[PDB]
Every structure is written in structure tokens, then in C-alpha cells.
Design a protein around this ligand. Structure first.
Ligand SMILES: CCN(CC)c1ccc2c(c1)Oc1cc(N(CC)CC)ccc1C2c1ccccc1C(=O)OCCOCCOCCOCCn1cc(CO[C@H]2O[C@H](CO)[C@@H](O)[C@H](O)[C@@H]2O)nn1
Ligand SMILES: CCN(CC)c1ccc2c(c1)Oc1cc(N(CC)CC)ccc1C2c1ccccc1C(=O)OCCOCCOCCOCCn1cc(CO[C@H]2O[C@H](CO)[C@@H](O)[C@H](O)[C@@H]2O)nn1
Ligand SMILES: [Ca+2]
Ligand SMILES: [Ca+2]
Ligand SMILES: [Cl-]
Ligand SMILES: [Mn+2]
Ligand SMILES: [Mn+2]
Lengths: 237, 237
């Protein structure tokens, strides 16, 4: 099975598998049942921003989601990455719909990682930034329904000709290169990610959400992970 | 056959392919016969640094090689990358030995590329930095004889357990992800690369050199490209 660390922007309450009763952001460590959540006043049709940060000094994974002129939703959690992930991983965005639906449109995505070994500036780093996406975005691995379209955006889940979202869709985008996120010789390991997103839904209840995730390098969309499993997990354990 | 743009640090004069009669730096555009060169006072067994810069404003590819407390060697040449390379490329380092030999050790390597589209801050960027190479360096594609060591270095060509280099060796390391180096809607496409290198020879005569190159994404070492072809070119044309 894949190993997943994720921050979920969960638009649909699946109370029967642990979700609080409202849209929420959550920190997911090898399970769709979030280790920590916070209430998220999601806004239909508006562009939001997510920021995810980790450092190995405090060993705290944190995330904040916001819209311009609204209160932010924020969540933090203890995590030792040497403990949960392999040394080398890929990073990605995932989204899904199920019975209920929403656009899962990514307008920008940036990531930076740094791994300072043993010595006094002996730092390896990777940074990438996408402020638009091309039709052939060769440095992304697109999985499932994910496409990079005419608009210059990444559509994680299937969108019709008119821009209207489709149900029972799942897609991910992974950065092409593996990332060295820990090494036992590192004096400080750290990363950050940011992305801007447009979740819009004709439905009463949008579903199901978007996540930034870190996985084993050979991760793929697990079977039956559309809808509530957010393209990340094979089951709800 | 591959499409190659390179900066060569050429330690061995092959004057029958237009090398000048001394070690030299050169700019190579689809041929081992450099479009331009400058004399380079190579220093056997000392750590040197190379810096390669390109912007699409001036459309000029420039390179400097130096050692601490020595004069530098510099070369520049007109290059429209859109006219030479595909939109997507890989970036790498190559070296070879032939009948004469040298260590072709890389101690660090960084690269940054930026592509500003149509719009006003519509920048995509990639940056990586290796100040130490690990034994399993998963974000490098190693070709031929190249290896990464538990000593933290990248040996592009074959070195024996006792430290002495081998003849008839060729090896390359390419960053794992494809790089978007130009786009027809770009206001500015630019990049820079730096590496530190250690070339040592027990011989009186070191050969053959190290190069930073940009290639078609599917580039591989041309058959028989040891010696003067620097692992870059299938022939001397
Ligand atoms: C919200 C209004 N409700 C509550 C009244 C609702 C909505 C749809 C069905 C519901 C109930 O019940 C059944 C029951 C059955 N049974 C078998 C004959 C008896 C167990 C079969 C189909 C449905 C549907 C349904 C019919 C047609 C097409 C698809 C679905 C569907 O996917 O249901 C979900 C899975 O079914 C199997 C068990 O079902 C109970 C689970 O929990 C029940 C509460 N529930 C279901 C859902 C929507 O779940 C889907 O969409 C979600 C949002 O996109 C995703 O998170 C989720 O993964 C799934 O895709 N939300 N809450
Ligand atoms: C293994 C013992 N060694 C090492 C001690 C060895 C063996 C033979 C030679 C050696 C060295 O050196 C030279 C040097 C010269 N020079 C000019 C007066 C001085 C710059 C001329 C000939 C030789 C020969 C030699 C003599 C007779 C018959 C054939 C060769 C021969 O090199 O054939 C080799 C292949 O050739 C094909 C290319 O053909 C046009 C080249 O133009 C000729 C000028 N030349 C050849 C060389 C060396 O080329 C090899 O080594 C280079 C350095 O590693 C590589 O750049 C090159 O690709 C090739 O591996 N350098 N200049
Ligand atoms: Ca949910
Ligand atoms: Ca030469
Ligand atoms: Cl590729
Ligand atoms: Mn949830
Ligand atoms: Mn030359």
C-alpha cells in the first residue's frame, strides 16, 4: 500500500467515517481519518489560497486556508517524517468528486524543500513554481482524470465543455522528480507548499475536496478512492 | 541523434577538431567544434568553479571558470534557444577520458530556470541545489560510468578504489525532471547553473573534460563518445 501524508480541504461531511459535521481542513497521516481538523468556511466560486509548512526543528506540520477578506482556517500537528515517510517521496495535489461534485481547479502551485545535512551550509534544495500550466506540462505526472487545459489551469477532476463539474471523478498531479524530504544526517529538513484553488459547484453540497500530499514515489490512485477517500486512500480505516 | 547545447571545460587539445592548442572553455551548439573558446589555465588537483548564465533578453549564453586567487576564463556567444532546443529539455553534466585520463569529480551543482509568460508576474520556475550527493541520488539520472559516492561526490567518469582515474570512460548525470526552457509566449526565459569540480591526473597530460549541457529530454550517451567527444556528440562534425 501507499504511504500518505496529506492536508485535506474537505468540502463534504462524511460523518460516518469520522468527519466533523462541517467543511474542514485536516491533517491526514496514513489514514483518511484526520489526526486534527479545523472548521473551514468554504466559499463556493471564490479563489482561495492554501499554505502548508513543515520544519524538523519543531517537527510540526501546519496548514492555513483562506480567502481574501475572510478569516483563515488553520491546523497543526506533531509529525516526525523519518517516522512516517520514506526518505525519498513525491509531492502532489489530489481531488475527487462522488455523488456530489465541484470544480477542483488549481490556478497556481509552488513547493520548496531543503535538507541540511551534518555540516554548516550543506543544504540540498528543490523549488518549483507553476503560475500557469501548459497543455503539455511534462514536469507533472498526471493521474486519473487530471488535465492541464486551455485556460492555463490544472483541472484535477473532470470538468465539462461549459466548465461544469462531473461526479465520480478523481485526479492527481505529482511533481516529476522525487524529493529528498529526510535523511537521518540532516540538522534541519523543511518544506512549504502553496496553491491557489477555485472550488465551484452547481450542487447544494459541494464535494469532495482537494489535498496536497506527500507519498512514496511510486504512488498511484488507489482503487475505489473516488469521493470521500479524496484519491488518497484504499479504504476508510 | 540528440540536440545538444553545452559549455565545455576542455582539458585536452584535439586540434584536428578545431581545439585551440591549450586547455580552454567553449560554447558548443550542436557540434563538438566550439562556436567560441577562451584559454583556460586549468589547475591540476584544485577545486574550481564554473558559472553558466543565459537570458532571452540579450539571447546570450555566457560562462566563467575560475579557481580561488586565479584569473578567470570567460566566453559568451549569441544563442536563440528557441532556434536550437525543443521547448522541453533536460539539463546535465557530462565528462570523458580517452587515451589520457583525469578524475572528473563534481562537488556541487545548482541550477535555476525561469519562464515569464505573456502576463506581468506569470512566472514558472525550477531550482535545484546539490551541495552533497548521496549514494542513492534518486533525482539524478546517471548514464554510463557516472556514480554518486558515500563520500558525497558525483564521479562522472570511472575512478579506481585507489583513487586513480580510468581511460576510455564516459558518464553523465541529468536532473530527473524535464525543464521548460522556452515557451513562445515568454517575455523572459532565463537560466543559470553553477558547479564545483575537481580534476586530477597522475599523467603529465589530463583528458578530456567536463561539460554542462542542455539536451532533448530523451538524450543518452552517443555510442563511442569517450575521449574528445565529451559524452555529448556522436562524431567530430
Ligand atoms: C445524502 C443523501 N443520502 C442520504 C439519504 C443518500 C444519497 C445517496 C444514496 C443513499 C443515501 O443511499 C443509498 C443506499 C443504497 N443502498 C443499497 C441498495 C442501501 C445502503 C444505495 C445507493 C444509495 C445512494 C446513492 C444513490 C444513487 C447514486 C449514488 C449513491 C451513493 O453513492 O451512496 C453512497 C454509498 O452508498 C452505499 C451505502 O449508502 C449509504 C452510505 O451513507 C449514506 C449517506 N450518504 C450517501 C452519500 C453519497 O455518498 C457519495 O457521494 C459523497 C459526496 O460526493 C462521497 O463522499 C461518497 O464517497 C459517495 O460518492 N452521502 N451520504
Ligand atoms: C594509449 C596510450 N596513449 C597514451 C600515452 C597514446 C596512444 C596513442 C597516441 C597517443 C597516446 O597520443 C598521441 C598524441 C598525438 N599528438 C599530436 C602529435 C599530441 C597531441 C598524436 C597521436 C597520438 C597517439 C597515436 C599515435 C599513433 C597512432 C594513433 C594514435 C592515436 O592517438 O589514436 C587514437 C584515436 O585517434 C582517432 C582520432 O584521430 C584523429 C586525431 O588526431 C591525432 C592527434 N591526436 C591523437 C590524440 C590522442 O587521441 C586519443 O586520446 C585523446 C585524449 O584522451 C582523446 O581526446 C581522443 O578522443 C582519443 O581517445 N591526441 N591527438
Ligand atoms: Ca469528506
Ligand atoms: Ca578536447
Ligand atoms: Cl521525460
Ligand atoms: Mn475529512
Ligand atoms: Mn574543445
Amino acid at each position: 500500500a501507499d504511504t500518505i501524508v496529506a492536508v485535506e480541504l474537505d468540502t463534504y461531511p462524511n460523518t460516518d467515517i469520522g468527519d466533523p459535521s462541517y467543511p474542514h481542513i485536516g491533517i491526514d497521516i496514513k489514514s483518511v481519518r484526520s489526526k486534527k481538523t479545523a472548521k473551514w468556511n468554504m466559499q463556493n466560486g471564490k479563489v482561495g489560497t492554501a499554505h502548508i509548512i513543515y520544519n524538523s526543528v519543531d517537527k510540526r506540520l501546519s496548514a492555513v486556508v483562506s480567502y481574501p477578506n475572510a478569516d483563515s482556517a488553520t491546523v497543526s500537528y506533531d509529525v516526525d517524517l523519518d517516522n512516517v515517510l520514506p526518505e525519498w517521496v513525491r509531492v502532489g495535489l489530489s481531488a475527487s468528486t462522488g455523488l456530489y461534485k465541484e470544480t477542483n481547479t488549481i490556478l497556481s502551485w509552488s513547493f520548496t524543500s531543503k535538507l541540511k545535512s551534518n555540516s554548516t551550509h550543506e543544504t540540498n534544495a528543490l523549488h518549483f513554481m507553476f503560475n500557469q500550466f501548459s497543455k503539455d506540462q511534462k514536469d507533472l505526472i498526471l493521474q486519473g482524470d487530471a488535465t492541464t487545459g486551455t485556460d492555463g489551469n490544472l483541472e484535477l477532476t473532470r470538468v465539462s465543455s461549459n466548465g461544469s463539474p462531473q461526479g465520480s471523478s478523481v485526479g492527481r498531479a505529482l511533481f516529476y522528480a522525487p524529493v529528498h524530504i529526510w535523511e537521518s544526517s540532516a540538522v534541519v529538513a523543511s518544506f512549504e507548499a502553496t496553491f491557489t484553488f477555485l472550488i465551484k459547484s452547481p450542487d447544494s453540497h459541494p464535494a469532495d475536496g482537494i489535498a496536497f500530499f506527500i507519498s512514496n514515489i511510486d504512488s498511484s490512485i488507489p482503487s475505489g478512492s473516488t469521493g470521500r477517500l479524496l484519491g488518497l486512500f484504499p479504504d476508510a480505516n
